[PDB]
Amino acid sequence: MSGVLEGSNVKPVEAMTDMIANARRFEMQMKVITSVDENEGRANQLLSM
């Protein structure tokens, strides 16, 4: 049909939920990184004599 023009199809609710989930997952991964680094750094002291 003529006289009309179709826009885009992006869901704001999906976008917001995806952004929130991404932020939370990023924070959890960062916490894991910190814990692993701390454990390795304290474990390397065992190598001393």
Add this chain to the structure above:
Amino acid sequence: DRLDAALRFQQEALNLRAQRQEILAANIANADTPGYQARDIDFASELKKVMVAVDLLYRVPDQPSLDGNTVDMDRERTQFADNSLKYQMGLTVLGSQLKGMMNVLQ
């Protein structure tokens, strides 16, 4: 030559301890090289063969790693500490034996 052999047992034990220490240091230094295979030797059988030119074995991996690195850290660190302690024990045993041999001649 009797003295040679009597001290030779402990001298060879110490030499093999030093070699194993060197290999452990090497696989600590190369701990982040991709495509590396952990190497180690069997101390007991190696010492038996030497008493009666050193072959090395691949350490069994524990966890997979995409970059092809199989040298663990904790197991080899414990191995390093144990090897250092046993090297010191062998050193002090040899020193005690030598001093006991020496003081008789006084």
